Amino acid sequence: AQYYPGTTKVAQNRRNFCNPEYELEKLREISDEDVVKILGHRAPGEEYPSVHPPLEEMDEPEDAIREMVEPIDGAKAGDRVRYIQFTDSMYFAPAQPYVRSRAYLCRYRGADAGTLSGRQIIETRERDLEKISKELLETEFFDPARSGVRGKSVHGHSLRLDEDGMMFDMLRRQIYNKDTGRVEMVKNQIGDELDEPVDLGEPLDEETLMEKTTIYRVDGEAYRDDVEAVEIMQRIHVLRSQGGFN
Amino acid sequence: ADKLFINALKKKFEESPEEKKTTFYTLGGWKQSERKTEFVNAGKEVAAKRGIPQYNPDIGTPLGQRVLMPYQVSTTDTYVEGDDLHFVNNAAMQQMWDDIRRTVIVGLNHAHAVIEKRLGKEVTPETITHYLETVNHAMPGAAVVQEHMVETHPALVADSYVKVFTGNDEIADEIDPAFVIDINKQFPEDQAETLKAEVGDGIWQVVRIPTIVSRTCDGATTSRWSAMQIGMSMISAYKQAAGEAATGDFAYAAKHAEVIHMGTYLPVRRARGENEPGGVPFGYLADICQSSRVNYEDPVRVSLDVVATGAMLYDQIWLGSYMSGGVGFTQYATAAYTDNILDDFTYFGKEYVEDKYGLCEAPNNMDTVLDVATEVTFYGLEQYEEYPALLEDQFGGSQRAAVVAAAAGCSTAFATGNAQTGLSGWYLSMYLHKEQHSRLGFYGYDLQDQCGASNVFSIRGDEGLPLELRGPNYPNYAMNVGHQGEYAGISQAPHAARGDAFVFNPLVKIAFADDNLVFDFTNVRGEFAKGALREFEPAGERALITPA
Amino acid sequence: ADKLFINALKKKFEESPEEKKTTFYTLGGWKQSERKTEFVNAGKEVAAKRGIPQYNPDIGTPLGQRVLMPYQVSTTDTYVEGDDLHFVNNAAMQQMWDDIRRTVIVGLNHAHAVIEKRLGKEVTPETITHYLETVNHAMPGAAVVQEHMVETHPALVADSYVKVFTGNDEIADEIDPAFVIDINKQFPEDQAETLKAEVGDGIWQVVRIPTIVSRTCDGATTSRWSAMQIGMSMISAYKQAAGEAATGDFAYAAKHAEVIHMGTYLPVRRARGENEPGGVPFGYLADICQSSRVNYEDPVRVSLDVVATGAMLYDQIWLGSYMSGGVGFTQYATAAYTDNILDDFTYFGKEYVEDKYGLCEAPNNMDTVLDVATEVTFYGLEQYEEYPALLEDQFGGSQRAAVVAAAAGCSTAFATGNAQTGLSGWYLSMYLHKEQHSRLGFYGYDLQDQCGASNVFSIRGDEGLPLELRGPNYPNYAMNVGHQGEYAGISQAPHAARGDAFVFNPLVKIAFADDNLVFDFTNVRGEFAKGALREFEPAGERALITPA
Amino acid sequence: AKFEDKVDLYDDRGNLVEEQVPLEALSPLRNPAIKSIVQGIKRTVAVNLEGIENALKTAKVGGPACKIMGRELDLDIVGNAESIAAAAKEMIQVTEDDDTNVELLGGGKRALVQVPSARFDVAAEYSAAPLVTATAFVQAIINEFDVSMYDANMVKAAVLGRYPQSVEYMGANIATMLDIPQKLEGPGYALRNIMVNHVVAATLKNTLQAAALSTILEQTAMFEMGDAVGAFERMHLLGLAYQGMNADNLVFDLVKANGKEGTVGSVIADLVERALEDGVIKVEKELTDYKVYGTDDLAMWNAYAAAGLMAATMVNQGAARAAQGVSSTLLYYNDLIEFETGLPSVDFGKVEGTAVGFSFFSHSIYGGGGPGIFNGNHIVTRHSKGFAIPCVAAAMALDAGTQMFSPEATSGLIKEVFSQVDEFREPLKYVVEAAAEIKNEI
Amino acid sequence: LVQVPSARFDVAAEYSAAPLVTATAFVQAIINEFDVSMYDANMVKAAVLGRYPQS
Numbered sequence A: 001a002q003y004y005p006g007t008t009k010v011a012q013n014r015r016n017f018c019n020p021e022y023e024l025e026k027l028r029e030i031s032d033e034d035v036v037k038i039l040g041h042r043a044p045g046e047e048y049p050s051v052h053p054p055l056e057e058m059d060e061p062e063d064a065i066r067e068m069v070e071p072i073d074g075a076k077a078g079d080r081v082r083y084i085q086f087t088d089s090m091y092f093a094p095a096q097p098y099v100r101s102r103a104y105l106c107r108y109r110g111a112d113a114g115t116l117s118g119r120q121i122i123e124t125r126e127r128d129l130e131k132i133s134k135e136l137l138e139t140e141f142f143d144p145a146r147s148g149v150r151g152k153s154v155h156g157h158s159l160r161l162d163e164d165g166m167m168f169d170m171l172r173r174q175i176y177n178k179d180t181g182r183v184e185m186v187k188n189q190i191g192d193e194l195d196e197p198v199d200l201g202e203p204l205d206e207e208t209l210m211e212k213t214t215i216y217r218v219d220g221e222a223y224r225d226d227v228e229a230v231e232i233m234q235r236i237h238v239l240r241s242q243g244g245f246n
Numbered sequence B, C: 001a002d003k004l005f006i007n008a009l010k011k012k013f014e015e016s017p018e019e020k021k022t023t024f025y026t027l028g029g030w031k032q033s034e035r036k037t038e039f040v041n042a043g044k045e046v047a048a049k050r051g052i053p054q055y056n057p058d059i060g061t062p063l064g065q066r067v068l069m070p071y072q073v074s075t076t077d078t079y080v081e082g083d084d085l086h087f088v089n090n091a092a093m094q095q096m097w098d099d100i101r102r103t104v105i106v107g108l109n110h111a112h113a114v115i116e117k118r119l120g121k122e123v124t125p126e127t128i129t130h131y132l133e134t135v136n137h138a139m140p141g142a143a144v145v146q147e148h149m150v151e152t153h154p155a156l157v158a159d160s161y162v163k164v165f166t167g168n169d170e171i172a173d174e175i176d177p178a179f180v181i182d183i184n185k186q187f188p189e190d191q192a193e194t195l196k197a198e199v200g201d202g203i204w205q206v207v208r209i210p211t212i213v214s215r216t217c218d219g220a221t222t223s224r225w226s227a228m229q230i231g232m233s234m235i236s237a238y239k240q241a242a243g244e245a246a247t248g249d250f251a252y253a254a255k256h257a258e259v260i261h262m263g264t265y266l267p268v269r270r271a272r273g274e275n276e277p278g279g280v281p282f283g284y285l286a287d288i289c290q291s292s293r294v295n296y297e298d299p300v301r302v303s304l305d306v307v308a309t310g311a312m313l314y315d316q317i318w319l320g321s322y323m324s325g326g327v328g329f330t331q332y333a334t335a336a337y338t339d340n341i342l343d344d345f346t347y348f349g350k351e352y353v354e355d356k357y358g359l360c361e362a363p364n365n366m367d368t369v370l371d372v373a374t375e376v377t378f379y380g381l382e383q384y385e386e387y388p389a390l391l392e393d394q395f396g397g398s399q400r401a402a403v404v405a406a407a408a409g410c411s412t413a414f415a416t417g418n419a420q421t422g423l424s425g426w427y428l429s430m431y432l433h434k435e436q437h438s439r440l441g442f443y444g445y446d447l448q449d450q451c452g453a454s455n456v457f458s459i460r461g462d463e464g465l466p467l468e469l470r471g472p473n474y475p476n477y478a479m480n481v482g483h484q485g486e487y488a489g490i491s492q493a494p495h496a497a498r499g500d501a502f503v504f505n506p507l508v509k510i511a512f513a514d515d516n517l518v519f520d521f522t523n524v525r526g527e528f529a530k531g532a533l534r535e536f537e538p539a540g541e542r543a544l545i546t547p548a
Numbered sequence D: 001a002k003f004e005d006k007v008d009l010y011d012d013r014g015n016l017v018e019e020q021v022p023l024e025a026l027s028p029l030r031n032p033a034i035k036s037i038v039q040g041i042k043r044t045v046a047v048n049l050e051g052i053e054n055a056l057k058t059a060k061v062g063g064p065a066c067k068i069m070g071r072e073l074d075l076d077i078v079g080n081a082e083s084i085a086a087a088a089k090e091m092i093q094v095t096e097d098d099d100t101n102v103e104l105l106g107g108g109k110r111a112l113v114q115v116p117s118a119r120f121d122v123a124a125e126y127s128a129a130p131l132v133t134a135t136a137f138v139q140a141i142i143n144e145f146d147v148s149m150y151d152a153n154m155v156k157a158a159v160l161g162r163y164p165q166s167v168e169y170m171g172a173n174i175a176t177m178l179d180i181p182q183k184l185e186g187p188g189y190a191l192r193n194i195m196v197n198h199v200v201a202a203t204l205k206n207t208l209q210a211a212a213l214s215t216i217l218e219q220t221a222m223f224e225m226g227d228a229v230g231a232f233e234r235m236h237l238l239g240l241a242y243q244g245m246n247a248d249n250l251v252f253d254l255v256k257a258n259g260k261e262g263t264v265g266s267v268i269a270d271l272v273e274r275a276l277e278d279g280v281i282k283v284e285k286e287l288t289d290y291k292v293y294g295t296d297d298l299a300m301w302n303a304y305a306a307a308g309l310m311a312a313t314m315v316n317q318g319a320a321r322a323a324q325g326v327s328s329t330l331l332y333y334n335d336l337i338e339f340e341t342g343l344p345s346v347d348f349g350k351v352e353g354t355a356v357g358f359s360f361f362s363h364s365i366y367g368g369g370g371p372g373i374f375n376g377n378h379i380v381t382r383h384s385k386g387f388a389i390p391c392v393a394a395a396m397a398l399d400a401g402t403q404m405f406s407p408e409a410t411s412g413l414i415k416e417v418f419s420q421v422d423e424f425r426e427p428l429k430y431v432v433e434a435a436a437e438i439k440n441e442i
Numbered sequence E: 001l002v003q004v005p006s007a008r009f010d011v012a013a014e015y016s017a018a019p020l021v022t023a024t025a026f027v028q029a030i031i032n033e034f035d036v037s038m039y040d041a042n043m044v045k046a047a048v049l050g051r052y053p054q055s
């Protein structure tokens, strides 16, 4: 698959986040317990709540599509559907909102992805959400200064950075430690205090943010100079226009 | 000279507008704001008087971790917090909608035919003046025939009246001029000659019912109220029996055969009668706004006064209250009429088109769409990239999408002289913006945007329509903020560049050329600023009939 | 004892009420009246200020060749000229409508089930109380989640709030009492036990949106505004993502699956959305009036307070403005709530039935309709023949038809305990009155009257319905004054004689048992008199945001 | 034939049934099984006799929480259901040997009613089905018990609700898959105002049958709206065949190849390779390491991309066994395929746009609800001309129990009655058989 | 005078196919007769069927 036209680093980065054959760079290590704590849906050692009984207990009617399509593990169990949501700064965060939803529906099964300017969300079955969430938090999808895990109060994608290079957060869920140069998560994604903070590692430096970003800007690579990506957008406009007419 | 938004950015923030870094969390939350402090005090007084908790700044999350900004009303020097631009807190915005809701245009052409041909009586300018004196007694709610009538208090209904207009200058000048909208006084010469040619010898009433009645009731009351009092005044002024068979022809003519509503009724999921905001087509909204007859030398100013009119009515009152409610959609609309931002981007595009093509001289085709809409979209988006304070000001992607695309679509239509290629340029702008920044608006912003290119030039049943005829009930536009008031501006844009006196209905254009209206439609952004300052005096209040 | 209308007649005229002759033409026309003189003066001031003629007593025919009468508001000692009972001039009448239009009832039962099943979270009295503090900040137009929101001024929206009720005493006890409509406090013990059994363990919100918003917009805004702010307060109080798939179930439940609108939408010829007067069924209007829980040992007082609520809303505001306008229909309504006239006739009928049958004891059949409705129709008509001043007071035939038939219909239903036989008695009264005096009402008054007998017991598609389910959109009733509010009274009458806590919907009855409303629904006629005296203080005014 | 195209037709287990069927044999204008389904939908009513009896005994009539104290009537309607239904049937039929059907279900608690097709051929629209059914049952209950003139209006309120004070049959104890004509968003929309949960209930959650019933209703409305007239007809017919009828086994084979481990993106890759293999698209231009595809047949490209969209729904929402993500699949299947190819997405962007608004109005405070309560007449989902709603029906068929407003919550009366009708429950079978039958008449 | 074929109604819920199929067939025949351009054709649509679907 081709994924996206263009000859910039931004274009290639958009293709790499979509391509399931591209190995996302891992930047930090987070424990399973700390992914559960950041998500905030259940406490460590709480059983997965259910929204319906296990599929085995249901004995449903003959349907060729059900038989052909393997359920994800949380669907076999009857798990709740829960979410994780991220905000990405326009000052060169590595992932950005459409890049996430496009990549999530190439990489992940059984996924409900939504894109907005100031937030991007995926909803799926709880135990599968915890597996995906580890990868979204540990890899270059995430930078702890220019991206934020936020289930509400998302403002900040379009704000100026603070003096530490951190994006704004009304609820201050991610705190930069000047003594280590590392960010801690001090609250879960909906803003409740964690018993113990989670280390999210060091912010990427400016050179590495420029290498990895998927936003086009005049002070990085401008979209108007990726003339092959603009050509395909304009072609889609003209072909939709002519199709709707005749 | 500086970009037009620079002065406002310097007023909002201590940093220069190009600076990438700032300070948060040290402003004391809501205590930084004069307006939030007035609200906290008022919430304590309301809850104490009524015995039920109400506004409390500590419920939910704490506003003002960043600067709570003032906004410049564009074209003015007035800076207010955005709460003063919420329609609930702005009497000028409420009156603008009351003045539209309570107006209806009603012909006298069928009526005068009924008098001549069925009653066998003559109509002259003198009989028309006698009828107009009678209907300006009756229209606010006073009696002309029966004994023991009980009536409306004249000072509660002082804003209700009837005027007329005609394209025949010598007939206009014979009717008493207290009742006449004088086309030659209100319009520059070339636009007056266009409008009088459209009207010809036709004679039309502009009827405004009382704001206190329109607030108590609804828009669909307007043409009924108008017709009842036209009917009573035709009985009294032409000496009919008070209720004979011919009386029914004046009722059918005033309520159906020669009435022009400002809005048509809506389908049942969003059920509403006539004269509600969702029925007002975009070309009528551009014609209600009166910027065209005052600022005709400057097509940008005329187009962006129509955007201000439509962004406030369609996003703040219609989508933000009739179709939702709550805190609502103030800043989805303010982005199109504050800080001189849309103004900077649309003057850029006008100058671009003047240099490359000349206004209205470009070919009306896709090559022009691709050229102008792309150039203007990249100018607007570069401004948010070059000025971090501009991006923190227009913080929501929907706000930026509507502002950039409005400049791109208005500038395409300045080049082609045709609103349909303007509208194709609006959609191309959204597609380029979405790929540039990897984001566009809120979750549901581009429903119409993605249907948009294919439906611009479609001819199918519920798809195909010239932009001037579309409105908030065109199917793809029925739900979402950040489009409808910008489409009214794109519908105005080619006609302002052409010097056309109107966009879609010459009778609607003349009907708002009247300084007896309570809101001043020639200076919509000025009036929004006056209401924000708590300096506007609305009609409809009950002070006369309540305790002192 | 004197008939109940004697004191008012002695106030109106110098003659004793039995006297057959008077003198006319010597009162100076309009100059006899304090209120017309106020209007003449105000018209001249209005017309000079605006430069267009307006109220002028010399246009049309000269009012006041006979006595312009005062009216006693029934059950009060307040006497006013009829202009003070026009809805435009009476802020209590306007507020009564605003308090119905801006109310919706919204269940929490589906919402609590989405919380426990989809989200896997607990609901308790504690989490409900926390939710109610949150929604009482949000509902008037204030923010709970996003940064940089701009909000409504709390003092402009001080009449908006959310309460709850439940049949489960031990929750109603555990929820903070500022937020609870307490059934045991508000209703006598027998009615409280009926109402608690109907609600059971269900929990329902009563949501009132701001009067200033209802007046700016329309009735169909209310359930949308309510659902936006219930949705924000469920996200804030229960810790949802602020916008996930489950958020859609709260929206669908609050907007559609557990909402009770006060009125349903109308067909296109009279297009209107929900919460407009034409959609409010007669059974709901009787349950909105709160006379049933205060005056329950007097079924005539309960039934006549419902007639006053409905004659004013359905004839003055609805038929006289929404569906027509102008001077309108004040006195077609005042006949049913002034001078104690309907009261005298209905107390005669109640005594006749209590003595002959016992309340609720008569057979539910045509023999009872023929007996009681004919006896009470002849009593009421005899009063106009014995008291000339009574006939000159209720001068229009339609006023007399509605008053005599209301007493006949209510009395029939006090005998049978069934509203349908009371409705058949209403139509029989019309047919006897038309033959007795060789006239009935205005040109169109008995369209429903002549369809009436045949449609009382029909079962066909658009004909058959129990009276409590009919309303202003039942086809025969959709056009004409002098019926709708009287039908609401007939709907109340058998339920007041039986001692029933409600007529058609127990949730509507409980939803108006609330002293935090602006208008006092336990004493509708007292409130009309306070508004007539200019002593009622409405919500919704813009004084705080306009100059001094 | 006006069009040269032919398709191969399969059953819901992926087996070939009929090869080389002219495209117009599946047209709603020609196929007699589509005619029978549409006329069936117009004339079928579900009657809840238990509900009528309970409304009467409690006086709970006229809508939610409504009651009239003192009007209670205790009638043994379900105990006398046979006699009541027979008496109704004699008023509903036109003659003795027409196609009227009145059938008791649930021990007499429910009745399936099919009003005779002939009452419709002399009617403007379809409201004779509920209005003839309701009056014949109101009159049969009054006659069974000799209900008096004074009490009979309570039977009418228990059957048809608050109508005509309300515009709808508010509180009625009868149900239809169609809704009243005043609720249409535009003229020609009535076959679109059919709740997705009612199609999934009728088809017993069989995914392919729910997608086929939804597509037959959506695309037949496209003809009634004039959208499928002239330049656009072939586009609409190929959409019906490929997205709704599994033509060429395209949908089935994509799901088979991506069902175990696939994603929306893996389905897109397979569909683009299949279009290329069949000659529907070809490389027009090389940019830098990126092929720009073109097509000489936009209607056929649109149809193949539509089949892939259905398969992507079945893979994505089938894997989660949770219908909510259909809004996401409808958006990003189309957004990804345009940047994958340089060709326009399904319905020239109109599916993507419907999906943007549908996603918002199924995850927000403003309106909408779960997937099951949408329909082609809903303001959020009317915009694509038949290519979006069938995917929502396939997604709700695949939901294992995540919805509060499920088909068991909203559509139980419709399920009991309308799944009895073979051509509603299993339409793919009947429309295939019919297309084979008329194949030589095209 | 246009009479739309009866078979279109035996597969329709109601009667709006008569104006809707007539309007679109005349709009397309006028655009095809004169080769009206994509940019102008929406005016043919407006002249045949009016302000629908805004009204």
Ligand code: F43
Pocket (backbone or CB within 6 Å): A116, A117, A118, A119, A151, A152, A153, A154, A155, A156, A157, A158, B325, B326, B327, B328, B329, B330, B331, B332, B333, B395, B396, B397, B398, B399, B440, B441, B442, B443, C142, C143, C144, C145, C146, C147, C149, C150, C228, C229, C232, C235, C242, C243, D363, D364, D365, D366
């Ligand atoms: C709960 C939702 C989901 C939903 O259905 N509506 C919400 C909330 C709702 C509330 C918020 C009031 C409150 O705080 O109590 C109101 C005011 C509507 C109402 N009920 O009165 C609103 N949105 Ni929202 N909403 C807005 C916007 C936005 C932008 C904000 C992005 C940011 O970075 O700040 C994003 C969408 C996007 O990402 O593009 C957004 C999301 C959301 N919007 C998320 C909450 C986001 C969060 O958790 O912080 N709105 C805007 O982009 C600007 C205008 C602004 C509206 C108020 C106005 O116009 O003044 C407001 C319009």
Ligand code: F43
Pocket (backbone or CB within 6 Å): B138, B142, B143, B144, B145, B146, B147, B149, B150, B228, B229, B232, B235, B242, B243, C325, C326, C327, C328, C329, C330, C331, C332, C333, C395, C396, C397, C398, C399, C440, C441, C442, C443
């Ligand atoms: C012009 C009509 C025909 C018509 O369509 N409407 C009228 C007039 C209209 C006007 C009269 C205002 C004015 O004088 O300018 C208004 C107030 C409605 C409006 N446009 O605001 C009205 N009637 Ni009328 N109209 C009324 C009535 C009536 C009674 C009056 C009989 C008598 O002996 O005085 C008769 C019908 C009848 O004979 O039954 C009647 C007729 C008529 N009604 C005859 C005029 C009669 C005349 O020439 O004097 N109304 C009434 O019976 C009482 C209530 C009264 C209404 C005002 C109020 O409710 O306060 C008023 C209701």
Ligand SMILES: C[C@@H](OP(=O)(O)O)[C@H](NC(=O)CCCCCCS)C(=O)O
Pocket (backbone or CB within 6 Å): B269, B270, B319, B320, B323, B324, B444, B478, B479, B480, B481, C224, C255, D361, D366, D367, D368, D369, D379, D380
């Ligand atoms: C979709 C529909 O809601 P329902 O699905 O019918 O509840 C509709 N609301 C809206 O379109 C809300 C528009 C305003 C708020 C969102 C603006 S982006 C309405 O209330 O009629």
Ligand SMILES: O=S(=O)(O)CCS
Pocket (backbone or CB within 6 Å): A116, B442, B443, B444, C243, D360, D363, D364, D365
């Ligand atoms: O977050 S959402 O896009 O659903 C709402 C924007 S106000």
Ligand SMILES: O=S(=O)(O)CCS
Pocket (backbone or CB within 6 Å): B243, C442, C443, C444
């Ligand atoms: O005279 S009419 O019956 O037409 C009207 C009475 S208000």
Ligand SMILES: [Mg+2]
Pocket (backbone or CB within 6 Å): A029, A030, A031, A032
């Ligand atoms: Mg590890």
Ligand SMILES: [Mg+2]
Pocket (backbone or CB within 6 Å): B174
């Ligand atoms: Mg002269």
Ligand SMILES: [Mg+2]
Pocket (backbone or CB within 6 Å): none
């Ligand atoms: Mg250049």
Ligand SMILES: [Mg+2]
Pocket (backbone or CB within 6 Å): B515, B520
């Ligand atoms: Mg002025």
Ligand SMILES: [Mg+2]
Pocket (backbone or CB within 6 Å): C015, C019, C021, C022
């Ligand atoms: Mg004397």
Ligand SMILES: [Mg+2]
Pocket (backbone or CB within 6 Å): C518, C520
């Ligand atoms: Mg009081």
Ligand SMILES: [Mg+2]
Pocket (backbone or CB within 6 Å): D266, D269, D270
């Ligand atoms: Mg493959």
Ligand SMILES: [Mg+2]
Pocket (backbone or CB within 6 Å): D286, D289
């Ligand atoms: Mg190559």
Ligand SMILES: [Zn+2]
Pocket (backbone or CB within 6 Å): B214, B215, B216, B217, B218, C214, C215, C216, C217, C218
């Ligand atoms: Zn209003």
